[PDB]
Amino acid sequence: PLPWCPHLVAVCPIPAAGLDVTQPCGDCGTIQENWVCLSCYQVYCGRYINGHMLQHHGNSGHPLVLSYIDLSAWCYYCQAYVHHQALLDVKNIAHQNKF
Numbered sequence: 600p601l602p603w604c605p606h607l608v609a610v611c612p613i614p615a616a617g618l619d620v621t622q623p624c625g626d627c628g629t630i631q632e633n634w635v636c637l638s639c640y641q642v643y644c645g646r647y648i649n650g651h652m653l654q655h656h657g658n659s660g661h662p663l664v665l666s667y668i669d670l671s672a673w674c675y676y677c678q679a680y681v682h683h684q685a686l687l688d689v690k691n692i693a694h695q696n697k698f
């Protein structure tokens with residue numbers, strides 16, 4: 600992945616409620632291929648399901664999303680995966696919840 604991107608500034612603090620990696624898509628309710636938005640922590644499905652996270656990006660402009668499949672972070676603007684220390688806390692919380 601990229602070691603940095605200009606949208607890391609939009610990554611917001613993790614809710615003290617934590618993350619639920621089994622949370623369904625906020626629109627369609629699918630349990631498959633969900634992502635969590637690292638700005639507002641809404642959960643929506645991936646491109647290969649119903650594309651609700653891509654829709655959320657288009658309607659919010661929020662840049663960076665974390666996969667509940669493999670804990671990768673995608674930036675929609677840079678069209679790349681990104682990893683940086685600003686993402687370690689959220690990845691690690693997600694990992695602890697998942698495994």
Ligand SMILES: Cn1c(CCC(=O)O)nc2ccccc2c1=O
Nearest residue numbers: 644645646647650652653664673
């Ligand atoms: C990994 N990835 C993703 C991940 C997030 C998603 O599934 O909503 N979204 C894309 C959207 C348009 C074009 C490409 C991608 C892409 O390669």
Ligand SMILES: [Zn+2]
Nearest residue numbers: 624627644651
């Ligand atoms: Zn959906």
Ligand SMILES: [Zn+2]
Nearest residue numbers: 636638639661
């Ligand atoms: Zn968002």
Ligand SMILES: [Zn+2]
Nearest residue numbers: 604606674677
């Ligand atoms: Zn970016």
